[PDB]
Amino acid sequence: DIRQVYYRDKGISHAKAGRYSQAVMLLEQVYDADAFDVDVALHLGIAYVKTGAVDRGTELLERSLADAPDNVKVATVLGLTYVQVQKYDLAVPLLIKVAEANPINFNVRFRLGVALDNLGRFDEAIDSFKIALGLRPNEGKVHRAIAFSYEQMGRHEEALPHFKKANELD
């Protein structure tokens, strides 16, 4: 009744503030597969991945994606998690769309780049990494990444400056 609004509101806040174990503990008690609340599943999703229950969290995020395919945050979080467990094929489409809608999100763009480079899509990797550098030109790590993407294409002339700049910072 008012039990559940309190558990939901608090559990979600736990998750948002990084208190992930406490979010699992509360939200496990509201989450109901058959009365599907997407905010609950999202944030219990997040909290399971964070607490090492990666499969259960992934599954909940997929189910949330099925329920709300236009929810950007579900897509962001599923996308990045897929990068984290090396499901780069699944990640790229979710991360392209998220980056479209949210151009100021550096990590998304960067993980997109890294996802592309692991699929061998180097030209697209490079274009994403350039976009990531427009947002943080100081990012050594992007520089090492784009350098390696070029080198993998045998474009060594283009790699070196990026290698140099990644050391100038590192």
Side-chain angles (χ1 to χ4, degrees):
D1 208 59
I2 308 104
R3 285 182 51 123
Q4 307 287 74
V5 73
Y6 168 88
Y7 275 59
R8 176 196 197 280
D9 281 325
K10 198 167 156 72
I12 276 162
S13 298
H14 284 323
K16 297 204 172 134
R19 294 184 305 255
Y20 298 119
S21 299
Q22 281 160 304
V24 173
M25 280 180 48
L26 296 193
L27 294 178
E28 274 185 331
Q29 291 194 76
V30 189
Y31 177 61
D32 195 345
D34 303 306
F36 195 83
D37 184 319
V38 62
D39 250 283
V40 155
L42 175 42
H43 286 94
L44 176 62
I46 292 186
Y48 272 143
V49 166
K50 281 308 201 341
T51 63
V54 177
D55 294 342
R56 317 205 284 270
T58 297
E59 165 271 331
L60 220 41
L61 292 167
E62 285 168 329
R63 198 176 257 277
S64 330
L65 192 74
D67 175 86
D70 301 314
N71 190 305
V72 171
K73 281 59 81 284
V74 165
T76 304
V77 165
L78 186 52
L80 293 162
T81 303
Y82 280 153
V83 172
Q84 206 182 308
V85 288
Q86 292 139 107
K87 309 193 209 269
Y88 307 114
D89 297 279
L90 307 185
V92 168
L94 293 164
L95 297 173
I96 297 188
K97 280 323 270 155
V98 171
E100 225 176 79
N102 189 10
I104 292 341
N105 194 311
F106 165 96
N107 186 47
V108 158
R109 176 60 66 171
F110 178 73
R111 305 306 173 168
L112 177 48
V114 171
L116 292 167
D117 170 297
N118 290 269
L119 288 171
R121 299 159 47 178
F122 297 129
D123 267 316
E124 281 159 296
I126 288 162
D127 297 352
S128 267
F129 294 143
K130 274 191 260 214
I131 281 167
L133 282 162
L135 306 143
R136 299 190 195 160
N138 53 265
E139 277 284 338
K141 76 183 196 169
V142 182
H143 275 292
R144 256 280 200 159
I146 198 172
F148 190 47
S149 285
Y150 277 126
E151 173 171 291
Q152 274 164 113
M153 286 181 97
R155 293 164 70 173
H156 302 283
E157 183 176 340
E158 282 157 305
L160 217 212
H162 292 285
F163 275 113
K164 285 180 162 171
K165 205 151 275 190
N167 226 262
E168 290 169 55
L169 284 25
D170 209 314

